[PDB]
Design an enzyme around this catalytic site. Structure first.
Site, PDB file in Angstrom:
ATOM      1  N   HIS A 259      -2.508  -8.952   1.180  1.00  0.00           N
ATOM      2  CA  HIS A 259      -2.254  -7.548   2.110  1.00  0.00           C
ATOM      3  C   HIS A 259      -3.221  -7.325   3.091  1.00  0.00           C
ATOM      4  O   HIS A 259      -3.502  -8.400   3.754  1.00  0.00           O
ATOM      5  CB  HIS A 259      -1.934  -6.425   0.992  1.00  0.00           C
ATOM      6  CG  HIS A 259      -1.174  -5.244   1.493  1.00  0.00           C
ATOM      7  ND1 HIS A 259      -0.417  -5.513   2.769  1.00  0.00           N
ATOM      8  CD2 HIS A 259      -1.274  -4.036   1.103  1.00  0.00           C
ATOM      9  CE1 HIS A 259       0.077  -4.141   3.258  1.00  0.00           C
ATOM     10  NE2 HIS A 259      -0.325  -3.105   2.083  1.00  0.00           N
TER      11      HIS A 259
ATOM     12  N   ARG B 104       2.692  -5.932  16.460  1.00  0.00           N
ATOM     13  CA  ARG B 104       1.575  -5.345  16.705  1.00  0.00           C
ATOM     14  C   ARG B 104       0.596  -6.632  16.789  1.00  0.00           C
ATOM     15  O   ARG B 104      -0.580  -6.270  17.168  1.00  0.00           O
ATOM     16  CB  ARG B 104       1.236  -4.850  14.991  1.00  0.00           C
ATOM     17  CG  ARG B 104       2.223  -3.788  14.570  1.00  0.00           C
ATOM     18  CD  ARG B 104       2.065  -3.124  13.162  1.00  0.00           C
ATOM     19  NE  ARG B 104       2.388  -4.375  12.325  1.00  0.00           N
ATOM     20  CZ  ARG B 104       2.001  -4.405  10.848  1.00  0.00           C
ATOM     21  NH1 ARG B 104       1.509  -3.221  10.526  1.00  0.00           N
ATOM     22  NH2 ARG B 104       2.236  -5.428  10.126  1.00  0.00           N
TER      23      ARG B 104
ATOM     24  N   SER C   7       0.957  -1.323   0.028  1.00  0.00           N
ATOM     25  CA  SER C   7      -0.133  -0.027   0.172  1.00  0.00           C
ATOM     26  C   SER C   7       0.852   1.313   0.105  1.00  0.00           C
ATOM     27  O   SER C   7       0.500   2.218  -0.602  1.00  0.00           O
ATOM     28  CB  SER C   7      -1.212   0.126   0.916  1.00  0.00           C
ATOM     29  OG  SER C   7      -0.562  -0.213   2.432  1.00  0.00           O
TER      30      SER C   7
ATOM     31  N   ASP D  43      -2.458  -8.723  10.892  1.00  0.00           N
ATOM     32  CA  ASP D  43      -3.930  -9.415  10.649  1.00  0.00           C
ATOM     33  C   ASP D  43      -4.477 -10.303  11.268  1.00  0.00           C
ATOM     34  O   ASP D  43      -5.736 -10.433  11.640  1.00  0.00           O
ATOM     35  CB  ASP D  43      -3.853  -9.478   9.181  1.00  0.00           C
ATOM     36  CG  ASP D  43      -3.617  -8.133   8.271  1.00  0.00           C
ATOM     37  OD1 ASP D  43      -3.074  -8.102   7.246  1.00  0.00           O
ATOM     38  OD2 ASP D  43      -4.001  -7.051   8.889  1.00  0.00           O
TER      39      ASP D  43
HETATM   40  C1  LIG Z   1       2.616 -12.071   3.819  1.00  0.00           C
HETATM   41  C2  LIG Z   1       2.761 -13.096   2.657  1.00  0.00           C
HETATM   42  C3  LIG Z   1       2.408 -12.929   1.188  1.00  0.00           C
HETATM   43  C4  LIG Z   1       4.243 -13.224   2.649  1.00  0.00           C
HETATM   44  O1  LIG Z   1       4.699 -13.506   1.179  1.00  0.00           O
HETATM   45  P1  LIG Z   1       6.022 -14.255   0.983  1.00  0.00           P
HETATM   46  O2  LIG Z   1       7.399 -13.578   1.582  1.00  0.00           O
HETATM   47  O3  LIG Z   1       6.560 -14.500  -0.582  1.00  0.00           O
HETATM   48  O4  LIG Z   1       6.175 -15.769   1.568  1.00  0.00           O
HETATM   49  P2  LIG Z   1       7.564 -16.763   1.964  1.00  0.00           P
HETATM   50  O5  LIG Z   1       8.792 -15.908   1.651  1.00  0.00           O
HETATM   51  O6  LIG Z   1       7.194 -17.148   3.479  1.00  0.00           O
HETATM   52  O7  LIG Z   1       7.367 -18.001   0.960  1.00  0.00           O
HETATM   53  C5  LIG Z   1       6.205 -18.297   0.286  1.00  0.00           C
HETATM   54  C6  LIG Z   1       5.941 -19.775   0.481  1.00  0.00           C
HETATM   55  O8  LIG Z   1       5.345 -20.182   1.647  1.00  0.00           O
HETATM   56  C7  LIG Z   1       4.046 -20.522   1.585  1.00  0.00           C
HETATM   57  N1  LIG Z   1       3.365 -19.600   2.776  1.00  0.00           N
HETATM   58  C8  LIG Z   1       3.425 -18.187   3.185  1.00  0.00           C
HETATM   59  N2  LIG Z   1       2.403 -17.964   4.033  1.00  0.00           N
HETATM   60  C9  LIG Z   1       1.584 -19.067   4.112  1.00  0.00           C
HETATM   61  C10 LIG Z   1       0.446 -18.760   4.601  1.00  0.00           C
HETATM   62  N3  LIG Z   1       0.005 -17.930   5.768  1.00  0.00           N
HETATM   63  N4  LIG Z   1       0.041 -20.035   4.624  1.00  0.00           N
HETATM   64  C11 LIG Z   1       0.280 -20.812   3.880  1.00  0.00           C
HETATM   65  N5  LIG Z   1       1.558 -20.886   2.979  1.00  0.00           N
HETATM   66  C12 LIG Z   1       2.123 -19.805   3.330  1.00  0.00           C
HETATM   67  C13 LIG Z   1       3.587 -20.246   0.217  1.00  0.00           C
HETATM   68  O9  LIG Z   1       2.847 -21.557  -0.363  1.00  0.00           O
HETATM   69  C14 LIG Z   1       4.892 -19.897  -0.698  1.00  0.00           C
HETATM   70  O10 LIG Z   1       4.981 -21.098  -1.328  1.00  0.00           O
HETATM   71  P3  LIG Z   1       5.125 -21.224  -2.924  1.00  0.00           P
HETATM   72  O11 LIG Z   1       6.431 -20.510  -3.360  1.00  0.00           O
HETATM   73  O12 LIG Z   1       4.783 -22.782  -3.523  1.00  0.00           O
HETATM   74  O13 LIG Z   1       4.029 -20.200  -3.749  1.00  0.00           O
HETATM   75  C15 LIG Z   1       2.038 -14.253   3.373  1.00  0.00           C
HETATM   76  O14 LIG Z   1       3.173 -15.148   4.067  1.00  0.00           O
HETATM   77  C16 LIG Z   1       1.082 -15.194   2.371  1.00  0.00           C
HETATM   78  O15 LIG Z   1       1.182 -15.483   1.116  1.00  0.00           O
HETATM   79  N6  LIG Z   1      -0.118 -15.315   3.083  1.00  0.00           N
HETATM   80  C17 LIG Z   1      -0.621 -14.867   4.118  1.00  0.00           C
HETATM   81  C18 LIG Z   1      -1.423 -13.392   3.891  1.00  0.00           C
HETATM   82  C19 LIG Z   1      -2.847 -13.552   4.371  1.00  0.00           C
HETATM   83  O16 LIG Z   1      -2.644 -12.906   5.619  1.00  0.00           O
HETATM   84  N7  LIG Z   1      -3.763 -13.756   3.676  1.00  0.00           N
HETATM   85  C20 LIG Z   1      -5.130 -13.588   4.084  1.00  0.00           C
HETATM   86  C21 LIG Z   1      -6.009 -13.976   2.888  1.00  0.00           C
HETATM   87  S1  LIG Z   1      -6.163 -15.801   2.388  1.00  0.00           S
END
Ligand SMILES: CC(C)(COP(=O)(O)OP(=O)(O)OC[C@H]1O[C@@H](n2cnc3c(N)ncnc32)[C@H](O)[C@@H]1OP(=O)(O)O)[C@H](O)C(=O)NCCC(=O)NCCS
Ligand SMILES: CC(C)(COP(=O)(O)OP(=O)(O)OC[C@H]1O[C@@H](n2cnc3c(N)ncnc32)[C@H](O)[C@@H]1OP(=O)(O)O)[C@H](O)C(=O)NCCC(=O)NCCS
Lengths: 437, 437
Positions: free
Chosen positions: A274, A329, A244, A375
């Site tokens: 996000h 947080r 954001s 969150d």
């Molecule tokens: C914030 C976020 C985007 C971080 O992104 P990131 O730095 O690229 O994540 P990472 O470095 O930990 O590595 C990602 C891997 O771990 C997994 N991972 C990360 N968070 C996860 C979660 N909360 N649940 C499940 N798997 C997760 C993903 O499957 C991904 O695997 P891939 O390469 O096969 O796609 C987050 O960890 C996420 O993807 N999910 C949580 C976001 C959220 O709160 N969502 C609510 C709506 S459903």
């Protein structure tokens, strides 16, 4: 002579900084600060030191700092609310802009000035009134703020060809006006959608921003407002790297006005990955409770969590792209709950998830950060005070986030930061570059 | 068996690419592709290889390539319009998505499919109708597209927890629907604001996208439509590094749906320093003509240009953050004008500015690129065919830009590109990092 005014304190600050950076750059601009790998380019700048963003910095272990002011530090130093225990969001704003911890007196000025500016143009009030009831609160917010740009002082000084050097002063007017209006947009939405028939009523110059907000939402509970002050403050800002902030920063840099750039930031915050996780947590919990039933075990609790991971879904509210521990947080929200709502079933569930999720995530060997983020804990608090309409939650995140994002925008612009314009490659060119060449 | 359908051609392509990148990364992901300096961090990523962006690449000398397809190459190879001389924007889209040069037959399918999908929901039609007449066309566009998100198939499959692996297929539906609707939003705006009382009428399944657009705008001139095809195609895409593409890319990466991410891209394109230069050129010319009078000399012409630079203003439509020569999209527009409107006064002025501006810019010793960009030449063409309402011009840029931006969004998502989340620093931390540490 005289009394209080942030724009003068700004006027004093800016040149000193302008000089500071120019020496620094004149001497250290050449310095390799880091390198770019190809994984970094495919990983969405994961690891990349992209920007300069002044108003806060995120530490992977410690978590956020508002100057070098940690959330515990903010909790004790910032002016509370003349009979309260949570920091007034106002003085977080003053801190962010000015680097200084406000005085009580500064903050009343902020409060009262935000009250002064707080009006909505007839057309935005029109649009709001006609919006469909299946149009998501975030979509409604964003649209409104794009519409409000009509009223930008920046956009009008720019059309009338001002000198670059006074941009900040106009970008300060609009920001201060945006922030004032925002809870009127937000509370009009909550009111149309969930309280049909009723009005947001009048802003009272004697209240703080948080209180006028809760009043317009229609919440009388004293502790709800306090929850509000704490909410709006900890969601303020989270360095510039997050979607954001980075959106507003990007769009800002093209000298799109503060309404436009903010509403772009909003269609970022409404990303599932996000700020929409707020909502997503509660939808997930709610389902868990229905589907997995009232008082589950640590064994069934895990069956639910695996059914999600095994579905190529994400567990909401867990993980982070930079923090490598539990979000402060998160902790901060947990404390509140321990303090005010300890017997709450939903809370107790969120507390038991903290017991289980990070171990399930650690087992799956995927997540680099198995720990909870802001969150994960937020909606459970809102729920408690009767704010049960979880599709709106991100808008609160949205109102709060303006504070950090528009504090930086004024600096970006007073420092004369350029058009953000990186270079891109296709895999094709990449494959030929590193190896082939 | 059977006939034509891009989503199947996609279905075939994606796995091959998915494999291609994974080998490449499994072997070359470590590779330092470049370094980050501190000037780079203060210069808005100037120089930074930020992203992977497939659908085009910008060369600093040559200018854009759509595969390795230069604008001259596109001009001769892409399907024209069944009695025309300009590329149909449709087959640029097919090229972008698929990497392949379409067949006539592919492109009729595109045309007709875009026609199928082209409808606007009652509420967006409502909002449009109530918008104020001092609300900028760009603001009007953006708002509308945020509002349309209501109708996102993505956003609804996501709420219903699909498997990550089918994201693209939904993001393809929405993109194809966005693109179809867009000229109905845009032509409703032009029609409310400038043609009060009249209706945009019906889309005809037998026309191309460009023609239905010009019809809804109310333009009958045959050559205007041709101008339209050429316009919509050359503005398509401009690698991912530019603010509008990068915005959509950023906001996209949070899994904000294709309407949301596009309208964020719009509050980027409405940046003065970005696509709003279209407009800004014409306002500047128009003033020049009034203020500096009809048929000026190369000596007075320069007095006008210095009065701007000396005012801490920018000369619109000149310069670029990556090109280091004249935009081929400039040349391409110049050719058209040479061909169709050579005696046009405004043209002759734009041609004389090309004589003077880059020398004045070279003299001032500031600009790293003293040469003209697309925006320098665009409005003069529109003007000629009676499109004199220069506040709308950026919206055309906006309709065209969707093509590149949404072509990449489908790939981003079919390749499983992460959350774009760089790291930020304050000057404070920076000053302590490189030197202090
Ligand atoms: C914030 C976020 C985007 C971080 O992104 P990131 O730095 O690229 O994540 P990472 O470095 O930990 O590595 C990602 C891997 O771990 C997994 N991972 C990360 N968070 C996860 C979660 N909360 N649940 C499940 N798997 C997760 C993903 O499957 C991904 O695997 P891939 O390469 O096969 O796609 C987050 O960890 C996420 O993807 N999910 C949580 C976001 C959220 O709160 N969502 C609510 C709506 S459903
Ligand atoms: C596209 C653009 C943003 C490129 O950004 P950039 O890569 O950061 O620009 P450069 O690398 O050439 O260096 C910028 C310096 O040159 C000057 N410059 C660049 N383009 C200029 C222009 N067209 N006129 C005047 N000065 C210009 C700027 O003053 C700047 O000086 P500064 O550091 O004191 O602020 C663009 O060149 C610009 O600023 N203006 C033109 C945009 C336009 O079409 N605007 C229309 C609305 S007024």
């Amino acid at each position: 002579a005289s009394s209080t005014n942030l724009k003068d304190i700004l006027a004093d600050l800016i040149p000193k900084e302008q000089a500071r950076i120019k020496t620094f750059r004149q001497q250290h601009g050449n310095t390799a600060v880091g390198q770019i790998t190809v994984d970094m380019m495919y990983g969405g700048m994961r690891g990349m030191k992209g920007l300069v963003y002044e108003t806060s910095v995120l530490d992977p272990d410690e978590g956020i700092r508002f100057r070098g002011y940690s959330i515990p530090e903010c909790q004790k130093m910032l002016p509370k609310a003349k009979g309260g225990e949570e920091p007034l969001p106002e003085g977080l704003f003053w801190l962010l802009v000015t680097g200084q911890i406000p005085t009580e007196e500064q903050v009343s000025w902020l409060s009262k000035e935000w009250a002064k500016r707080a009006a909505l143009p007839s057309h935005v009030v029109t649009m709001l009134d006609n919006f469909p009831t299946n149009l998501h609160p975030m979509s409604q917010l964003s649209a409104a703020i794009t519409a409000l740009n009509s009223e930008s002082n920046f956009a009008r000084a720019y059309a009338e060809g001002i000198h670059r050097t006074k941009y900040w002063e106009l970008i300060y007017e609009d920001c201060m006006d945006l922030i004032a209006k925002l809870p009127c947009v937000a509370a009009k939405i909550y009111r149309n959608l969930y309280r049909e028939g009723s009005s947001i009523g009048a802003i009272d110059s004697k209240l703080d921003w948080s209180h006028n907000f809760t009043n317009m939402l229609g919440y009388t509970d004293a502790q709800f407002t306090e929850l509000m002050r704490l909410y709006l403050t900890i969601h303020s800002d989270h360095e510039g790297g997050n979607v954001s902030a980075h959106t507003s920063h990007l769009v800002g840099s093209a000298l799109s006005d503060p309404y436009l750039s903010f509403a772009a930031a909003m269609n970022g915050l409404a990303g599932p990955l996000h700020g929409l996780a707020n909502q997503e947590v509660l939808v997930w919990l709610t389902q868990l409770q229905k589907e997995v039933g009232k008082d589950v075990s640590d064994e069934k609790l895990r069956d639910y969590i695996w059914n999600t991971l095994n579905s190529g879904r994400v567990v909401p509210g867990y993980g982070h792209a930079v923090l490598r521990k539990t979000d402060p947080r998160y902790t901060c929200q947990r404390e509140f709950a321990l303090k005010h709502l300890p017997h709450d079933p939903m809370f107790k569930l969120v507390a038991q998830l903290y017991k289980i999720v990070p171990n399930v995530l650690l087992e799956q060997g995927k997540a680099k950060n198995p720990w909870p983020n802001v969150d994960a804990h937020s909606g459970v608090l809102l729920q408690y005070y009767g704010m049960t309409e979880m599709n709106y939650y991100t808008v609160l995140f949205g109102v709060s986030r303006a504070l950090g994002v528009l504090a930086q925008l004024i600096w970006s612009r007073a420092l004369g930061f350029p058009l953000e314009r990186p270079k891109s490659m296709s895999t094709d060119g990449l494959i030929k570059l590193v190896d082939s060449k």
